[PDB]
Each structure stands twice: as structure tokens, then as C-alpha cells.
Amino acid sequence: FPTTTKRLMGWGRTAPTVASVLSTSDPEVIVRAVTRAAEEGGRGVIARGLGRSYGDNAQNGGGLVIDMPALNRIHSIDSGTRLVDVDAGVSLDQLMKAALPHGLWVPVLPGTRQVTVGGAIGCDIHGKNHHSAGSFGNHVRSMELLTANGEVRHLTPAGPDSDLFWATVGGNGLTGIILRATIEMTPTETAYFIADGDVTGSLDETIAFHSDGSEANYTYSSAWFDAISKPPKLGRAAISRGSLAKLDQLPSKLQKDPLKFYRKSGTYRNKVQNLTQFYHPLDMFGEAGFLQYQFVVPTEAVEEFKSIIVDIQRSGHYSFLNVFKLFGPGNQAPLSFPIPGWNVCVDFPIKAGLHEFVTELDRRVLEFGGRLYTAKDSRTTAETFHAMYPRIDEWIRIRRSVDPDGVFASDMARRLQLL
Numbered sequence: 001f002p003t004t005t006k007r008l009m010g011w012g013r014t015a016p017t018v019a020s021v022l023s024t025s026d027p028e029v030i031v032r033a034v035t036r037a038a039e040e041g042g043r044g045v046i047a048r049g050l051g052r053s054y055g056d057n058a059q060n061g062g063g064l065v066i067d068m069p070a071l072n073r074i075h076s077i078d079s080g081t082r083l084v085d086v087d088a089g090v091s092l093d094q095l096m097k098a099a100l101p102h103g104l105w106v107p108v109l110p111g112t113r114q115v116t117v118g119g120a121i122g123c124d125i126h127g128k129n130h131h132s133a134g135s136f137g138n139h140v141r142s143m144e145l146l147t148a149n150g151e152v153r154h155l156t157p158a159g160p161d162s163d164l165f166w167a168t169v170g171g172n173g174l175t176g177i178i179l180r181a182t183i184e185m186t187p188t189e190t191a192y193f194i195a196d197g198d199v200t201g202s203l204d205e206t207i208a209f210h211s212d213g214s215e216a217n218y219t220y221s222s223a224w225f226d227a228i229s230k231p232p233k234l235g236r237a238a239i240s241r242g243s244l245a246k247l248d249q250l251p252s253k254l255q256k257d258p259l260k261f262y263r264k265s266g267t268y269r270n271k272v273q274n275l276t277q278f279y280h281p282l283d284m285f286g287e288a289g290f291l292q293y294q295f296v297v298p299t300e301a302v303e304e305f306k307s308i309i310v311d312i313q314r315s316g317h318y319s320f321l322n323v324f325k326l327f328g329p330g331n332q333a334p335l336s337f338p339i340p341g342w343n344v345c346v347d348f349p350i351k352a353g354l355h356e357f358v359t360e361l362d363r364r365v366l367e368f369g370g371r372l373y374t375a376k377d378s379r380t381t382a383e384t385f386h387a388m389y390p391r392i393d394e395w396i397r398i399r400r401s402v403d404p405d406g407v408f409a410s411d412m413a414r415r416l417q418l419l
Ligand SMILES: Cc1cc2nc3c(=O)[nH]c(=O)nc-3n(C[C@H](O)[C@H](O)[C@H](O)COP(=O)(O)OP(=O)(O)OC[C@H]3O[C@@H](n4cnc5c(N)ncnc54)[C@H](O)[C@@H]3O)c2cc1C
Pocket: 011, 046, 047, 048, 049, 050, 051, 052, 053, 054, 057, 058, 068, 088, 089, 109, 110, 111, 112, 114, 115, 116, 117, 118, 119, 120, 121, 122, 123, 124, 125, 126, 127, 128, 171, 172, 173, 174, 176, 177, 178, 179, 282, 283, 284, 285, 286, 375, 376
């Protein structure tokens, strides 16, 4: 085993640990890494992708961490079936580039493309198109999961160990190492969006804006809101909504290569945009000076959702950067973050009182029927987490089925009692 010793941290740059990291482009060397741990039984193993998760789910202090990005080969891309067969360490960035010439679009994109296929599945990631496309797990056809008995299992969403499939989706790697997957891509005639922009003047307008049925006219939607001004301005937002452009909707110059790659206001229509124009401000979150916090509360819990936003602004913890989105229906994964409702990611300068205020937020999110997102948590308690996810015991049951001895472990699994 080629291993080096590395100090590791998540994107939040908090709670670093040291571990042994194995990188290899050979799946075989990883299967062997697993069996020598299913015998050693020290602190366990965890996969790590590109480490874009904020907290501590992709590290294992004094354990073994597998550097999955080294295992980044694309096996095949088929315009016909729309299927793409990929090592788990392939970037969505790498994948999008390889797939674009074939008229194929990564079906769920987060705000950064430096995420592996494996981490996308591990956190069941969502994008601006959640209300139309659900989360990344919804698009997975199969995965090969290396389990603690050193076996590589072929898993599918409906099929024999379907429950295992769904506990892996959003399982934060605690089910075993995903080595390879087949994703069903989205067909596109173009690499561009056609987008509408709008600005609201308050929280209540922001909410009404999302609640008229409008969202059905766009496959992609999100908003950046003001969380610093006092009502009536609190919650005013710049909304950006769009769908992938068809070839006949581009200007002729872009119609040349369609699969490539007055004051400017937040108000505009039928504007042609590429991915990075269209995805602002979602890309710029992690640039430990800042604590990110993301929650969703159910659609019906409107006054309760507004009350969170009101309290944030009263607290004096100022988040300049954020995101607001209305999620659509969730999937079958027991620990998948998204449920229908109001989703917000906020970004607070760390200072006296922050951690305590966010504990207060947790209790409210929890009280209102909502949850926190593991990809963005460095911080919450095991007890709150378990209460936010009513299917957690079911998931722990599956988890133990497949790793009775605790071969797969992370700092997060300890912190949140997932083992
Ligand atoms: C700037 C920025 C913007 C973001 N925007 C969004 C967004 O819009 N929506 C969203 O949902 N998320 C967003 N995220 C979160 C990010 O998409 C997730 O944290 C994703 O999991 C990170 O992928 P990664 O490859 O870096 O995984 P890591 O962070 O390295 O891993 C995260 C989890 O996946 C597991 N994992 C990784 N590889 C494997 C494998 N082969 N097998 C099993 N498990 C594995 C890990 O063990 C760990 O538990 C954002 C993050 C950043 C920094």
C-alpha cells in the first residue's frame, strides 16, 4: 500500500485530523485496503472525494482514508441510452466536459463542479433544478459498492439490495466505498440556459414569488436574498430561473458551437447564459473565517420559516452570501437531505456567540419539521441530527447489516453517532 500521512480538513477548514491516505488508480489496491482493515479492525476506513464537504464526513482521524480522485476514469458515454459509466473519483467537471460533445448534461449540478461522482452520491447532492429533477441519487442507475467483507456489490435503485442502494445514497460513505457507477444523463441540444431574472422587495414577496405555480415554468431556480437589512427589506431577493436552451433559441454565433465548454439589473428575460453566469452566487461559498449553515423547513411551515430569517437578521450575525430555493419532492434514501420546502444556506463570519445561535437555529429547524444537510455540517449534535431524520434507525440497521464490525468510519459518524 502506497500511503502517505496527511493532515485532512473539510471545506470549512475546521477540526483537522491526521490519517493515512491511500491513493491508487487501481480498484484492486482499494479492495485489498479494505480486507486488511476488516482484519486489523483499527479506526476504520473512509472514502474521500475532492473534499468539498464542509465538515468532517470524509476524514477518519488515525484511520485509513482512500483518495478516490486518483480513480477517475470514464469507462463509457452513450448518447443512445444516455448512460455514462464512471469511476467514483471522476469530477462532475471532468464528466461534464467529456459528456457535452455527446449532447449530454450532468443531471444534477451543485454550485461547484469539483465534486466526485462518489461524493455526489455520498451526500445525495442537489442543485438549482431540485424541484424538477430531484437530487443526484435519483439519476443513479447502478453503483459498485465495495463492502466491509471485501465484496464488490452491484446495486440498483429497484433490484435486490435496493435498501442498501438507498442507504448509500446520502450515506456519507458509511456503507462502503463506491468504486464505479452508471449515471443516467440528461439530453440537451445545448450547453446554455435561457434565463429570467427578477427582484423582490421583501421576504413576503420572495415567498409569494415562489408560491404562485411559477416554478413549474423553469427546470432551474434559485435566489440570493438580503439577510442583513431590517424588515421590510429583509428577505428581498434576486431570483434567477431558467431552463437549458434548445438549439433554435440561441443566437447564430452560439448556434455555431452549441455544446461548447443602461444598467445591468436583476430583472431580465429570455437571457442566454452559460453554466457559470447562470449559477452565480452558488460557486463562491467557501472563499475557518465563515461558518456555513444549510437547512430546509417544510413548505407549509411558512411563518416558522420566516421566523428563522427574521431571527438571523436580529441576531447581528451577518450573512452577505446565501441561497434560497424551493425544493420539490424527496427520494427514498433514509438520510437524503432534501424534503419539499424552503431551503436556505447562509454564511456567517465566526465570532462570539455564533455557535450558540446556530444551536438555537437547530432547535427551531428541528421543531418545525426540518433538517440540516451533512455536506455543510461541521457542528450539530448527534441528538439533534437523529431527531431531524426520522428514518435514521432504519438506516443504522442497514448500515450495520453490511459493516457489522465498523470497518467504515469517519469523524462525522463518531460525532453524530452513525456507527
Ligand atoms: C462552493 C461549494 C458549493 C456547493 N454547492 C452545493 C450545492 O449547490 N448543492 C449541494 O448539494 N452541495 C453543494 N456543495 C456540497 C458538495 O456538493 C458535497 O459536499 C459533495 O459531497 C462533495 O463532493 P466531494 O467529492 O468533494 O466529496 P467529499 O467531500 O470528499 O465526500 C463527502 C462524502 O461523500 C463520501 N464519499 C466520497 N467519495 C466516496 C466514494 N467513492 N464512496 C462512498 N462515499 C464517498 C465521503 O466519505 C463523505 O462522507 C457545495 C460545496 C462547495 C464547496
